[PDB]
Each structure stands twice: as structure tokens, then as C-alpha cells.
Design a protein around this ligand. Structure first.
Ligand SMILES: Nc1ncnc2c1ncn2[C@@H]1O[C@H](COP(=O)(O)OP(=O)(O)O)[C@@H](O)[C@H]1O
Ligand SMILES: Nc1ncnc2c1ncn2[C@@H]1O[C@H](COP(=O)(O)OP(=O)(O)O)[C@@H](O)[C@H]1O
Ligand SMILES: [Mg+2]
Ligand SMILES: [Mg+2]
Ligand code: NA
Ligand code: NA
Lengths: 308, 308
């Protein structure tokens, strides 16, 4: 049985490294190209799986080499692919990433087959969804499918962890009321609330707006400043610092955070949220010290015994 | 285009020969003074260059005569000096060496300009670093600078060869996780692990402690006993013996070994690690048969065709 079910996105990262980003109209030469496995859904599922969670990825890829490789990536990470669909109607979702020597990038995301994960694909997963402890969603598939995933879990008493990423300014009100744990970053919080979030006190203000909209728990991640959390039971914001560490590559750090939190929500329910968030901050602080997104997500074996 | 990029130290050896060593407060007269070229980084880079490698030395010397001389020493070794910086704020790195008839010595090393190589200098060197096949670093510049160089290489998919020399007891944990090949000698391994490392058996235990810290490959050099190698994909220590030879001067044999290893990592990447280390042993073994450190490093010209 999958304890953590993620309903969300799989994307092939297509990365070109250059000395400079190109300008409009120009063709430039880069020095290296490589492929990575990305997508917030898959990233979150991968971190939870490596921590030890029995996971299942509900998603859609293309009946192409990219999709075949993504399925094998999930299998290699011991993630169930029972409800990883393949479609001939769209290519596997893609992120064309151009990165210069300063780490500055330009990214073009084509959602592709991710947008074809539909409500019937979800209903076929009804039995896995109802036996899970945690249901994780984001906003890189059709919102209607994420909303239906949240409803099914909620109807079977499964804990919902929703990550409104990328953030939509007019996010449907029902997302908030279907979220047990609503987790986003400073930029998404700005988009969702219209407030400027450049400190932990600003994040506390923005978290209360998100909490008034119906979330049970709100977490706003703050990069190196850690995170701030509010709930319906303790609505006073509390800042939870993270480990002061030298960052090698912060890409996918939030996905490591969310995947870690999923694991603690499903396997350590009798821990306090503040403790779960301390541990999730730590795991995420470890991923920021390595390169390559999913390549940077640590295993249970390589973490202190004190986190389990 | 440089396949081997060495980010590290250059130092001017200021050698005085005497009959006896001086005691506190004593002025003695010596019989000869001469200048030599040293620094682990330059040593390594010279050996890789002599083997045929297209190399570049990212380093900082003084805007003084020692620095201009160092630049010409590098040029005379067919090394690119496009990233050899000069500074008005410190003297070129120096080793002041007094040697007596008995062969005893006192050495005073002043890092000097080496410690002023900063992250802006690395940022200006970013294209050469990211376009390399291997990036080599040691611990004779500011450790933060070496860590940032390893970070850049790793992010660009460039092979990192780290030589923690001279060794430091509380080496930042990221030095291990950012090292693809982590190479040191016996006494460096003893400093880094707190174990006795006298024999190949001892080196096996020590290399294992290092591999569990995050290294992909650990090599411990063992003088006349050659070296020991472990890896993530082969956690079992293997012993590569060297040539039994009549040593005349083993000074800088480690740097010969490392420069040779960088050459094979960059130009022969499909060779087995064992094959590379046996060739690198042979090369370091040739260096041991003459005096003069960089002076003893052999050329592709003067070596067996079977090494290539
Ligand atoms: N420099 C850093 N040092 C320590 N932890 C970090 C650092 N950057 C990110 N983190 C950790 O990763 C989590 C998510 O980071 P953040 O950048 O806010 O998310 P996202 O990746 O969604 O932008 C943070 O809450 C924190 O625990
Ligand atoms: N007497 C020797 N005979 C043959 N090879 C030697 C001898 N001394 C050193 N070497 C070679 O040089 C390499 C580095 O030597 P070592 O003394 O361990 O390094 P360091 O210069 O860091 O002290 C060894 O692995 C070996 O291949
Ligand atoms: Mg995120
Ligand atoms: Mg050495
Ligand atoms: Na990372
Ligand atoms: Na020698």
C-alpha cells in the first residue's frame, strides 16, 4: 500500500549551459547539454520515496522516449507507476532551460501530456487514493484534476498537502478549503495575496490571509530564513529557522521540503508540526548543498538517525 | 581550450644552502642561494602539461618580480596563463628554505597572493572552468575559494579532482560531497580521519571513512607502496603497487601523481581507474628518480609509448 500518493507533474528538463543568455533574435553556442528529470509532482514523490515512504505517482507522460525514460526514473526510485499513464496525444511535459555562468536562466515550460491527466484517470486510482495517508498536489496539471484529487482524498479521510506552484492569482476558492496543509514559497504567497513578502513578518501577514480563506495549516517557505507556519488551532505565526549552510544549487529545494513533509505527515503523525517542519527544513537544507534537483535529494541512509 | 584546469597555488622557493642550521638570534653564512618554482597547483599543472594536456592555471601571484617569473615558468611549460592574476596587496606566495650539509631543513611558507584569489577571480574564470574536462584544487589557497571552484565545476558537470593538501582536521563536509576524485597521501589521510595510515591495509580503512563522507572515489597514495582506491560503485579497497625504484628525491611526487591522474581523467575517460592509477604510479615513480620537484617531472617524449 502507498502511504503517500502524489497526483501531479513529470517534466523532462532539457538543459543548455552557455557563457551568456541569448537575446531576442540571436543564435548563440553553448558548451554543454544534459537532461534531467523534473516536475514538482515527481520531485516531491522522489524525496518522499528516498526517505523511505511507500509512494505512488499518478501522472501522465507521452508515449515517447522521454516518457519511457521518466517511467524508468520512477521505478529506479522505487515509486509505484501503477497509475503513471502514457498518451499518444501529447509529448511528455518539458522544461527547456538555458543557464549562463552566473547561474541566471531562461526557462520555457511546455506542460504537454501533464495537461491530459483527467478526472477518469483519477477515478481509476480511487482505491489507492483512499488507502493512502497523504495526498500531494500542485498546479502543474489541469486545476480541475488537482481539485478532484483533493476532493477524493478528503472524502476518504486522507490528509491533503497542496502546493499552489506555480501560483495563480485567482486560484479557485475551493483549493483552500480542501487543503489540510497548504504549502508555498514567498513568491507564490505574493501572487496569491498581493502582499509583498520580503521578511518572515511579511510572510506571517500573507499566511493569515491564506488561513482565513480556509486552509487548516499554512506554511510559507523562506529560502535560507526557513519557513513560517500558522494553523487554525495556533493561528499565531511562528518562524522556524533552517540550518545556515553554503548553497550549491537551490533548484527543487521546495519540492524536497514538500516531499519530506509528506513523509512525516504519513509516517510520523504523532510528531508535532513544528518538529516535522524542523526536520523538513533540514532535509531541504541538505538538498541545497548538492547539484541537479532529483540528484540532490538525500536518502534515509545518508541522513542523521535523529530525523527518524 | 583547456581540458585540465587547475585552481590553486604558485609559490617561489627561496633556497639557501649552509653547512649548519641557525639557532635563535644567529646569523650564519651559507654558500649558495637559488630560486625554484613550487606550489602544489602549479606542480600538478606542470606535470599534466608535460604529458600533453592543454592546461590552464587559475591562480593569484604578486605584481612583483616573483609573479612575472612565475608567469614565464608556466608559459615555458606550455600552460595557459590567461587566468594567472596579479595583486599589489601581497607578495607572491613563497617558501623560504634553509638546508644544511646533513640534508636537514627549516621551511617557512607564506601563502601570500595565493590567499587573495577570490570568488570574483573565479567568476571571471567561469568559462574556462565550465568548458574543462577536469578541475583540480588543493588547500594552498583560501579554502572558501577552492570550495567555490569545486561548486562551479560540479554545477557544470566538470570532473572534480580534490587534493586536500596540506590537510586540515575540520575540513568542511562539502569538500567531500563535491569531490568526484578525492586524492591524498598517508599523513593527510591520518589528519582527515584520525586513523593510523602506514600500510595499504590502514589506507583501506581510512579511504572507507572518506568515501562515507560523500566522495565518489577516494585514492590514498602510499609512497613506494603505490596507492589504494575505493569508490561508491566499488566500495572495496584495491591496492595498486608502484615501481620499486632507487629514489633520489621524492619531493612533489604526490603532485606528479595528481597531474598525471588529471591528464588521464581528461584525455582517457573510458580507461578503468586501476589502469589510470598504474600509469600515474609509473609517472610519479619516474619523478622520484631525479631531484628538483617540477624539474623532475617527465615529458610524454621521454616516457614509454604504452602509457599512452
Ligand atoms: N540557502 C539555504 N540554506 C538552508 N536551507 C535552505 C536554503 N535555501 C532553501 N532552503 C530550504 O528549502 C526550503 C524551501 O526553499 P524555498 O527557496 O523557499 O522554496 P522554493 O524552492 O519553492 O523556492 C526552505 O524552507 C529551507 O528549509
Ligand atoms: N620511492 C618511490 N618509488 C616509486 N614510486 C614512488 C616512491 N615514492 C613515491 N612514489 C610515487 O608517488 C606517489 C605519491 O607519493 P606520496 O609520497 O604518497 O605522495 P606525497 O608527495 O603527497 O607525499 C605514490 O603513489 C607513488 O606512485
Ligand atoms: Mg516550491
Ligand atoms: Mg601530495
Ligand atoms: Na540542490
Ligand atoms: Na623528484
Amino acid at each position: 500500500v502507498a502511504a503517500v500518493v502524489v497526483v501531479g507533474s513529470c517534466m523532462t528538463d532539457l538543459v543548455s549551459l552557455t557563457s551568456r543568455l541569448p537575446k531576442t533574435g540571436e543564435t548563440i553556442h553553448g558548451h554543454k547539454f544534459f537532461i534531467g528529470f523534473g516536475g514538482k509532482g515527481a520531485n516531491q514523490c522522489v524525496q518522499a520515496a528516498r526517505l523511505g515512504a511507500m509512494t505512488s505517482m499518478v501522472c501522465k507522460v507521452g508515449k515517447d522516449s522521454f516518457g519511457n525514460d521518466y517511467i524508468e526514473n520512477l521505478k529506479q526510485n522505487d515509486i509505484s507507476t501503477e497509475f503513471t499513464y502514457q498518451t499518444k496525444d501529447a509529448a511528455t511535459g518539458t522544461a527547456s532551460i538555458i543557464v549562463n555562468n552566473e547561474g541566471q536562466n531562461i526557462i520555457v515550460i511546455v506542460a504537454g501530456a501533464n495537461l491530459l491527466l483527467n478526472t477518469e484517470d483519477l477515478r481509476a486510482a480511487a482505491n489507492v487514493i483512499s488507502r493512502a495517508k497523504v495526498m500531494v498536489c500542485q498546479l502543474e496539471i489541469t486545476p480541475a484534476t488537482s481539485l478532484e484529487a483533493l476532493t477524493m482524498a478528503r472524502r476518504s479521510g486522507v490528509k491533503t498537502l497542496f502546493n499552489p506552484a506555480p501560483a495563480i492569482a485567482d486560484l479557485d476558492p475551493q483549493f483552500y478549503t480542501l487543503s489540510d496543509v497548504f504549502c508555498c514559497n514567498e513568491s507564490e504567497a505574493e501572487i496569491l495575496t498581493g502582499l509583498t513578502v520580503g521578511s518572515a513578518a511579511d510572510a506571517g501577514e500573507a499566511a493569515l490571509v491564506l488561513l482565513k480563506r480556509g486552509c487548516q495549516v499554512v506554511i510559507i517557505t523562506l529560502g535560507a530564513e526557513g519557513c513560517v507556519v500558522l494553523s487554525q488551532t495556533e493561528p499565531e505565526p511562528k518562524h522556524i529557522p533552517t540550518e545556515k549552510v553554503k548553497a550549491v544549487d537551490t533548484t527543487g529545494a521546495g519540492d524536497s521540503f514538500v516531499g519530506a513533509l509528506a513523509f512525516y505527515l504519513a509516517y510520523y503523525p504523532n510528531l508535532s508540526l513544528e518538529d516535522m517542519l524542523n526536520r523538513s527544513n533540514f532535509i531541504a537544507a541538505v538538498s541545497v548543498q548538492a547539484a541537479g534537483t532529483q540528484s540532490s535529494y538525500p536518502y534515509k541512509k545518508d541522513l542523521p538517525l535523529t530525523l527518524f
